[PDB]
Structure formats: C-alpha cells, structure tokens
Amino acid sequence: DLKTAVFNAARDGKLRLLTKLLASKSKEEVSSLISEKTNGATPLLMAARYGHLDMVEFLLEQCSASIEVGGSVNFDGETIEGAPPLWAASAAGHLKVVQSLLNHGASVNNTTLTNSTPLRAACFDGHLEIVKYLVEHKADLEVSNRHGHTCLMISCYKGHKEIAQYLLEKGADVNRKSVKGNTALHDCAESGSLDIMKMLLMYCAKMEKDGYGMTPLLSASVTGHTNIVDFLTHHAQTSKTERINALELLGATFVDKKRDLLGALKYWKKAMNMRYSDRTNIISKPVPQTLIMAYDYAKEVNSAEELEGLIADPDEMRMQALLIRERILGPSHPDTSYYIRYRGAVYADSGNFKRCINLWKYALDMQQSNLDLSFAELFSFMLQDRAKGLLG
C-alpha cells in the first residue's frame, strides 16, 4: 500500500524514490499520506529521528501539518511514546535536523508523554551544540519531566560538565527540587561528579534533605562515592555530627556493598577519632530502643579500643554495618531492609539458615511497619533474558 511505501521511503531517506511515489498526486492527497501513522510514527518523525535532512526538508515543503505530531521512536531497544520530531532529532543528536525543524516553526518545548523537552533529551545524551541551539531558540530551562527532574539535574547525573556549566551560565535554578526532593547536588553525589558539585557550589547551591531524609553528603555515603564524602566532610556547611555519621555510614557501605572490611575500618576509625577529639564534648553513640535478634543482639562500638579488635571478627563487622545503617538511614529507607535481606542471603549461602530467616523476618516486619524490591522482582530481573549473541 502507498501509505507504508512513503513511510518506509521516509525512514530510509530515499528522496528520489519518495518523489516518484508522490508524482502527480494532489496536494491534499500527499498531505494525507505524509500525516499517516505507521507503527505509531509519521514519515517526518522517522526522517527526523534518523537524521535524513533532505527528507525532512522535502516533507515539510509538502505539508507542515505533522511537525508537532508525536509518535513512537526506538532508542537503543527502548520505545518512547508521544515523541515529536524535534525531540527525536535532539535525542539522536541530529543538529542540522534540529535547526531545520525550528526554522519551519517547530515548538521548542513540545514534550514527550513524560514531559521530557527536546532540551532534556539533548542534555541526557550530552549533545552540547544542540543544547546551546535550543536555549538560543527560547527552550525553557525549568520545564521538568513528570518526576520533577530538571535538565540541570540530568546533566549532573550523567556527569556532563560542559553542559551543566553552560546551563548554569544561562541561569538554570540550582536549587530546584524534584517531586521526591532530589536536587542537582544529590545528582552529583549519586554519580560521584565532584567537579560538577564544585561548580554548583560556585552558585551557592544549598545542601538539603531529599524525601528520604538524605543530604548530598549522605547520598554519597550510601552510594559509596568516597571522593564526594571526602570533599564534603571538609566543607564548612557540614557539622561535626553530620561528618561522623557520613563516615560511619560510608564504612557500612564498604562492608555490605563493596565487601571491603579494611576500607570500612579506615572510615570507622576516622569517625571514632572525631567522636573523641574534644575531650570535653564527646559525641557518644546513640543507644537504640531495643536489642535486635536479627542483629545477634549486637551494639555499636563506642570507643577506639572496641574498634581495634574488629578486623579478625568479620561477623561483628557485618552486624555493626546493619546497626549503623538502621540508625542513620532509618527503617523507612529502602536500603535498610535491602541490606538486611542481602546479609541474610549471604548467611543462607554459607549454610546459616536460622540467621538468614531471622534477618529476612526482621526485614519483612520492618517493611510492613513503614508503609504509608521484592525477592520475586530481584530474581526475575537477575535472570531476565539478556539474549547475548542472538544478534551477533
């Protein structure tokens, strides 16, 4: 059929072939043929997505009526819905197509269905020259996606220094918060982007708690980026108690996520030294409400002497890490029950099924008590059909 014929010709950029298929067709008829969806996409969306500049120019000369029509595009095996041509061209990095669509009057802030702008798509994949062209053509820096994530946030998350720098030079609001309270400083802390964090602080970005109660410092401790933790624990905006807790939580991350007991001890000793540095104002460990069977009824070490006999006792270290995480992150942070379950799984693998079951029981009780990453979802995600070699 002629519908799919012109579609496939647009998708492949075959200009002479396409003009042959429209020869001696009424203006009103070709405009109906170009405005036709095929596999959820228009001929213009395909020509723009694949960077066929002469095809994009030809189609728009015929009829500009689909220039804002969003449809289905594929990026690296993922399908994105309601994407207009400008967005797809920006996401794919086709600068000349970007310039051409804007010339024909494409709307610079027309988003996908998740409210991702063309500027967001360019920031995501790091297309600096497109980011600049969009901003020079009135793209709104502060239109965020449906989670409230901004262009500055995703640039920081992806470690795109030059783009982050340019957005800042053009006046991006450094203190925007996503729906869950994420700021661009958290994105730097979660990605370990220290140079970008320093750039944000040149604009006096404020360190704030996100929806999980996490500062950028704590986010770095949770994810294990020691470069961010080292920087921020020498930053005057973090108090002594915040520094001690961040170092102790980072140690727990070394135990459970990095499986690095020597590295954990280094940070626990650093924090313990700080707890006792002022002999007149000792920061002692807080005492929890009750001892916990799943933690083997352990309690946190409270002096430098109790730390010295710890490396030969890996089981004590694993219980310390659990005590520390529950103290600092709290029961309603998803990492707390996650790492309890992970520790239980390790005991199951070593044949300690009673320890395993008590840890899993505690994690489930914790999860159910704070309700307002299941075993089945973890299992299916793990063995999900990563069909390696099927293509080649």
PDB file of all heavy atoms in Angstrom, residues 281-295, unseen atoms left out:
ATOM      1  N   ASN A 281      33.752  17.541  74.953  1.00  0.00           N
ATOM      2  CA  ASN A 281      32.446  17.336  74.312  1.00  0.00           C
ATOM      3  C   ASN A 281      32.530  16.058  73.460  1.00  0.00           C
ATOM      4  O   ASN A 281      32.781  16.081  72.250  1.00  0.00           O
ATOM      5  CB  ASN A 281      32.032  18.551  73.481  1.00  0.00           C
ATOM      6  CG  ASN A 281      30.606  18.438  72.949  1.00  0.00           C
ATOM      7  OD1 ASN A 281      29.755  17.785  73.553  1.00  0.00           O
ATOM      8  ND2 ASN A 281      30.345  19.071  71.808  1.00  0.00           N
ATOM      9  N   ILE A 282      32.304  14.923  74.106  1.00  0.00           N
ATOM     10  CA  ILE A 282      32.396  13.632  73.435  1.00  0.00           C
ATOM     11  C   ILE A 282      31.072  13.353  72.737  1.00  0.00           C
ATOM     12  O   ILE A 282      30.005  13.430  73.355  1.00  0.00           O
ATOM     13  CB  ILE A 282      32.746  12.522  74.439  1.00  0.00           C
ATOM     14  CG1 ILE A 282      34.096  12.813  75.105  1.00  0.00           C
ATOM     15  CG2 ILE A 282      32.741  11.154  73.768  1.00  0.00           C
ATOM     16  CD1 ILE A 282      35.281  12.781  74.156  1.00  0.00           C
ATOM     17  N   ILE A 283      31.133  13.055  71.441  1.00  0.00           N
ATOM     18  CA  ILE A 283      29.953  12.628  70.696  1.00  0.00           C
ATOM     19  C   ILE A 283      29.864  11.115  70.863  1.00  0.00           C
ATOM     20  O   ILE A 283      30.543  10.365  70.167  1.00  0.00           O
ATOM     21  CB  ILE A 283      30.027  13.034  69.223  1.00  0.00           C
ATOM     22  CG1 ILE A 283      30.489  14.488  69.070  1.00  0.00           C
ATOM     23  CG2 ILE A 283      28.669  12.834  68.548  1.00  0.00           C
ATOM     24  CD1 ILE A 283      29.512  15.506  69.605  1.00  0.00           C
ATOM     25  N   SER A 284      29.045  10.662  71.804  1.00  0.00           N
ATOM     26  CA  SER A 284      28.898   9.228  72.039  1.00  0.00           C
ATOM     27  C   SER A 284      27.831   8.630  71.120  1.00  0.00           C
ATOM     28  O   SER A 284      26.940   9.332  70.634  1.00  0.00           O
ATOM     29  CB  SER A 284      28.543   8.949  73.499  1.00  0.00           C
ATOM     30  OG  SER A 284      27.411   9.708  73.890  1.00  0.00           O
ATOM     31  N   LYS A 285      27.937   7.321  70.882  1.00  0.00           N
ATOM     32  CA  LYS A 285      26.951   6.631  70.052  1.00  0.00           C
ATOM     33  C   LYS A 285      25.566   6.753  70.680  1.00  0.00           C
ATOM     34  O   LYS A 285      25.424   6.557  71.892  1.00  0.00           O
ATOM     35  CB  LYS A 285      27.314   5.155  69.894  1.00  0.00           C
ATOM     36  CG  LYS A 285      28.494   4.886  68.996  1.00  0.00           C
ATOM     37  CD  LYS A 285      28.153   5.156  67.554  1.00  0.00           C
ATOM     38  CE  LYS A 285      29.359   4.912  66.670  1.00  0.00           C
ATOM     39  NZ  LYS A 285      29.718   3.475  66.620  1.00  0.00           N
ATOM     40  N   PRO A 286      24.533   7.083  69.910  1.00  0.00           N
ATOM     41  CA  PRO A 286      23.169   6.979  70.436  1.00  0.00           C
ATOM     42  C   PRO A 286      22.823   5.522  70.725  1.00  0.00           C
ATOM     43  O   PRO A 286      23.347   4.602  70.093  1.00  0.00           O
ATOM     44  CB  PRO A 286      22.300   7.543  69.301  1.00  0.00           C
ATOM     45  CG  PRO A 286      23.249   8.297  68.410  1.00  0.00           C
ATOM     46  CD  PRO A 286      24.558   7.582  68.525  1.00  0.00           C
ATOM     47  N   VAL A 287      21.943   5.320  71.692  1.00  0.00           N
ATOM     48  CA  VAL A 287      21.526   3.986  72.124  1.00  0.00           C
ATOM     49  C   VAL A 287      20.163   3.703  71.516  1.00  0.00           C
ATOM     50  O   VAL A 287      19.218   4.472  71.756  1.00  0.00           O
ATOM     51  CB  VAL A 287      21.468   3.872  73.655  1.00  0.00           C
ATOM     52  CG1 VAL A 287      20.877   2.521  74.059  1.00  0.00           C
ATOM     53  CG2 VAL A 287      22.860   4.062  74.286  1.00  0.00           C
ATOM     54  N   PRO A 288      19.996   2.630  70.748  1.00  0.00           N
ATOM     55  CA  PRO A 288      18.686   2.345  70.149  1.00  0.00           C
ATOM     56  C   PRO A 288      17.676   1.895  71.200  1.00  0.00           C
ATOM     57  O   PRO A 288      17.999   1.665  72.368  1.00  0.00           O
ATOM     58  CB  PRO A 288      18.989   1.241  69.131  1.00  0.00           C
ATOM     59  CG  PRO A 288      20.249   0.610  69.608  1.00  0.00           C
ATOM     60  CD  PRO A 288      21.040   1.692  70.289  1.00  0.00           C
ATOM     61  N   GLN A 289      16.416   1.787  70.759  1.00  0.00           N
ATOM     62  CA  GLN A 289      15.322   1.466  71.675  1.00  0.00           C
ATOM     63  C   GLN A 289      15.456   0.062  72.270  1.00  0.00           C
ATOM     64  O   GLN A 289      15.127  -0.153  73.443  1.00  0.00           O
ATOM     65  CB  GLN A 289      13.980   1.600  70.951  1.00  0.00           C
ATOM     66  N   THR A 290      15.897  -0.912  71.473  1.00  0.00           N
ATOM     67  CA  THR A 290      15.947  -2.302  71.915  1.00  0.00           C
ATOM     68  C   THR A 290      17.055  -3.023  71.156  1.00  0.00           C
ATOM     69  O   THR A 290      17.480  -2.593  70.074  1.00  0.00           O
ATOM     70  CB  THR A 290      14.580  -3.002  71.720  1.00  0.00           C
ATOM     71  OG1 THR A 290      14.609  -4.328  72.268  1.00  0.00           O
ATOM     72  CG2 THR A 290      14.200  -3.091  70.235  1.00  0.00           C
ATOM     73  N   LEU A 291      17.555  -4.100  71.762  1.00  0.00           N
ATOM     74  CA  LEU A 291      18.405  -5.047  71.047  1.00  0.00           C
ATOM     75  C   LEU A 291      17.559  -5.867  70.064  1.00  0.00           C
ATOM     76  O   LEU A 291      16.365  -6.093  70.279  1.00  0.00           O
ATOM     77  CB  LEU A 291      19.129  -5.976  72.035  1.00  0.00           C
ATOM     78  CG  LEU A 291      20.086  -5.311  73.056  1.00  0.00           C
ATOM     79  CD1 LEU A 291      20.742  -6.341  73.963  1.00  0.00           C
ATOM     80  CD2 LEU A 291      21.151  -4.495  72.350  1.00  0.00           C
ATOM     81  N   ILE A 292      18.200  -6.331  68.990  1.00  0.00           N
ATOM     82  CA  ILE A 292      17.525  -6.908  67.829  1.00  0.00           C
ATOM     83  C   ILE A 292      18.065  -8.314  67.604  1.00  0.00           C
ATOM     84  O   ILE A 292      19.267  -8.489  67.359  1.00  0.00           O
ATOM     85  CB  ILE A 292      17.725  -6.048  66.567  1.00  0.00           C
ATOM     86  CG1 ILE A 292      17.279  -4.599  66.803  1.00  0.00           C
ATOM     87  CG2 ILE A 292      17.034  -6.679  65.346  1.00  0.00           C
ATOM     88  CD1 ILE A 292      15.781  -4.431  67.020  1.00  0.00           C
ATOM     89  N   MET A 293      17.174  -9.312  67.669  1.00  0.00           N
ATOM     90  CA  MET A 293      17.593 -10.704  67.486  1.00  0.00           C
ATOM     91  C   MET A 293      18.311 -10.901  66.150  1.00  0.00           C
ATOM     92  O   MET A 293      19.382 -11.516  66.096  1.00  0.00           O
ATOM     93  CB  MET A 293      16.385 -11.632  67.593  1.00  0.00           C
ATOM     94  CG  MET A 293      16.717 -13.114  67.375  1.00  0.00           C
ATOM     95  SD  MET A 293      15.274 -14.176  67.238  1.00  0.00           S
ATOM     96  CE  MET A 293      14.327 -13.753  68.691  1.00  0.00           C
ATOM     97  N   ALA A 294      17.744 -10.358  65.064  1.00  0.00           N
ATOM     98  CA  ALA A 294      18.351 -10.481  63.736  1.00  0.00           C
ATOM     99  C   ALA A 294      19.770  -9.923  63.680  1.00  0.00           C
ATOM    100  O   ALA A 294      20.570 -10.343  62.831  1.00  0.00           O
ATOM    101  CB  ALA A 294      17.485  -9.765  62.700  1.00  0.00           C
ATOM    102  N   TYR A 295      20.086  -8.940  64.520  1.00  0.00           N
ATOM    103  CA  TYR A 295      21.436  -8.396  64.585  1.00  0.00           C
ATOM    104  C   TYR A 295      22.301  -9.141  65.593  1.00  0.00           C
ATOM    105  O   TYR A 295      23.375  -8.646  65.954  1.00  0.00           O
ATOM    106  CB  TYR A 295      21.412  -6.901  64.937  1.00  0.00           C
ATOM    107  CG  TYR A 295      20.689  -6.002  63.947  1.00  0.00           C
ATOM    108  CD1 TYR A 295      20.343  -4.705  64.300  1.00  0.00           C
ATOM    109  CD2 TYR A 295      20.359  -6.445  62.656  1.00  0.00           C
ATOM    110  CE1 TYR A 295      19.683  -3.868  63.410  1.00  0.00           C
ATOM    111  CE2 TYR A 295      19.693  -5.606  61.748  1.00  0.00           C
ATOM    112  CZ  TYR A 295      19.359  -4.326  62.135  1.00  0.00           C
ATOM    113  OH  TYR A 295      18.720  -3.476  61.270  1.00  0.00           O
TER     114      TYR A 295
END
